[PDB]
Amino acid sequence: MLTRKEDLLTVLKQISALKYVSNLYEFLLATEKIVQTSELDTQFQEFLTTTIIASEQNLVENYKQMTIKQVIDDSIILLGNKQNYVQQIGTTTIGFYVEYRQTLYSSNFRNLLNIFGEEDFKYFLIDFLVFTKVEQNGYLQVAGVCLNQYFSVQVKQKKWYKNN
């Protein structure tokens, strides 16, 4: 469920498998998808700086330089048989069809789709764990391999009464 920023960050820095962690704004800058002077609404700009993303490797060079619903469906289809991605939750995939994300449909992500371009956006949701600020110091993962999949590997524990 919802997580506090400092908790998300401490968990993320502890996971050695995730070598890359940044806020979205800086990633878009490094990949040159946007530049310092790009015209950005304050809401969207606040969305870029508060959104946190993580990947196993540094994919900046890889990302250098249609409805949102459709792009997301295609993205999910690209997952193949892989499992445990946030976007797959409560989803069933059969061939090119997906049946059954509220945040991913927002204007923020639609603007993100237009800046990334169709192809890169599709892979973005796969290569990155994406955490968005839902409320005051309240983060939610909206895409990528479920964080729990990594914590579990980093900190392997058989049994416990509870560990949120």
Side-chain angles (χ1 to χ4, degrees):
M1 300 171 95
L2 253 47
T3 306
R4 286 179 166 61
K5 185 171 185 171
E6 65 281 8
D7 296 316
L8 174 63
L9 289 174
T10 60
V11 173
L12 285 177
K13 70 164 182 295
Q14 280 165 40
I15 301 176
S16 68
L18 295 179
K19 299 186 297 182
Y20 184 89
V21 184
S22 167
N23 67 37
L24 186 54
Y25 182 72
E26 295 293 321
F27 176 73
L28 292 181
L29 223 42
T31 56
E32 296 188 58
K33 290 292 187 177
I34 61 171
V35 287
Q36 160 205 171
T37 61
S38 292
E39 49 181 51
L40 304 177
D41 167 21
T42 54
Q43 176 175 73
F44 188 59
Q45 204 279 345
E46 194 171 63
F47 163 77
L48 297 182
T49 68
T50 61
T51 301
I52 295 174
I53 72 178
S55 62
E56 311 193 327
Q57 236 86 295
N58 182 302
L59 306 170
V60 177
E61 277 299 324
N62 296 268
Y63 287 73
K64 276 293 178 63
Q65 166 277 301
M66 275 295 261
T67 304
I68 180 76
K69 306 176 180 186
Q70 283 157 45
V71 178
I72 291 175
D73 287 342
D74 286 330
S75 180
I76 290 175
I77 291 170
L78 289 171
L79 288 175
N81 288 301
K82 296 174 187 174
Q83 312 184 70
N84 305 305
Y85 284 74
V86 176
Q87 56 262 44
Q88 289 175 306
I89 298 173
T91 259
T92 311
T93 296
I94 305 179
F96 282 79
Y97 299 78
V98 180
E99 203 183 71
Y100 52 77
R101 272 300 311 166
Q102 321 162 72
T103 301
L104 300 180
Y105 284 180
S106 66
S107 58
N108 281 330
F109 278 87
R110 287 167 62 189
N111 277 308
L112 195 58
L113 169 62
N114 293 330
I115 288 167
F116 262 102
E118 198 195 309
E119 184 178 298
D120 283 4
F121 190 75
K122 286 188 299 176
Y123 286 98
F124 173 69
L125 306 178
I126 299 172
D127 294 323
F128 292 86
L129 286 84
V130 182
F131 304 94
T132 299
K133 184 133 87 74
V134 177
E135 305 171 5
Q136 18 71 62
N137 191 46
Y139 280 76
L140 172 62
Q141 183 172 180
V142 301
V145 175
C146 294
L147 183 51
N148 189 65
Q149 292 294 305
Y150 288 92
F151 204 50
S152 293
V153 158
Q154 180 65 47
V155 176
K156 307 166 295 307
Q157 191 168 324
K158 308 294 284 296
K159 282 196 173 61
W160 62 66
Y161 284 99
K162 99 129 69 97
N163 69 173
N164 310 306

